[PDB]
Design a protein around this ligand. Structure first.
Ligand SMILES: CC(=O)N[C@H]1[C@H](Oc2ccc3c(C)cc(=O)oc3c2)O[C@H](CO)[C@@H](O[C@@H]2O[C@H](CO)[C@@H](O)[C@H](O)[C@H]2NC(C)=O)[C@@H]1O
Length: 129
């Protein structure tokens, strides 16, 4: 599913992401936009054999099992396929686990590049949340 921006904001807000580990909602909408363009089915193959999955583009070397990633750990304890569903429940749960590590939201390259230190008001503008 390709989420609408406000539709995504409402689902994140409803799932307790606004302030999760000190990361306000606009942070999460901005990273989703630059990481996958709000598409839950996005996938990206990396040069190291790992693949990024879903709306948050979670990497298979560390967080999920895709069965073809060498030296993988699967910390979220899931199949990467579960990160591609229209339903965000597993993705949100795994994203919550990722931000608890030492690097926080800095784990996402798109956040570091396009969201970090920026004015993120426009990402939730007009959503009513
Ligand atoms: C959201 C997701 O899956 N993010 C993970 C991620 O994913 C990517 C995915 C795509 C790219 C692309 C296209 C380019 C580029 O330059 O870097 C990337 C990192 O890779 C890093 C790189 O190692 C993982 O960070 C590493 O993850 C674990 C988990 O906390 C730590 O133990 C390490 O310390 C930490 N490595 C470093 C050096 O930051 C982080 O989790």
């Amino acid at each position: 599913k390709v989420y609408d921006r406000c539709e995504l904001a409402r689902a994140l807000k409803a799932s307790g992401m606004d302030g999760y580990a000190g990361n306000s909602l606009p942070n999460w909408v901005c990273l989703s936009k630059w990481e996958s363009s709000y598409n839950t089915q996005a996938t990206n193959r990396n040069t190291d054999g790992s693949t990024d999955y879903g709306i948050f583009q979670i990497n298979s070397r560390y967080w999920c099992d895709d069965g073809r990633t060498p030296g993988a750990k699967n910390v979220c304890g899931i199949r990467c396929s579960q990160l591609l569903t229209d339903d965000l429940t597993v993705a949100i749960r795994c994203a919550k686990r990722v931000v608890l590590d030492p690097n926080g939201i800095g784990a996402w390259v798109a956040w570091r590049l396009h969201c970090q230190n920026q004015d993120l008001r426009s990402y939730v503008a007009g959503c009513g949340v």
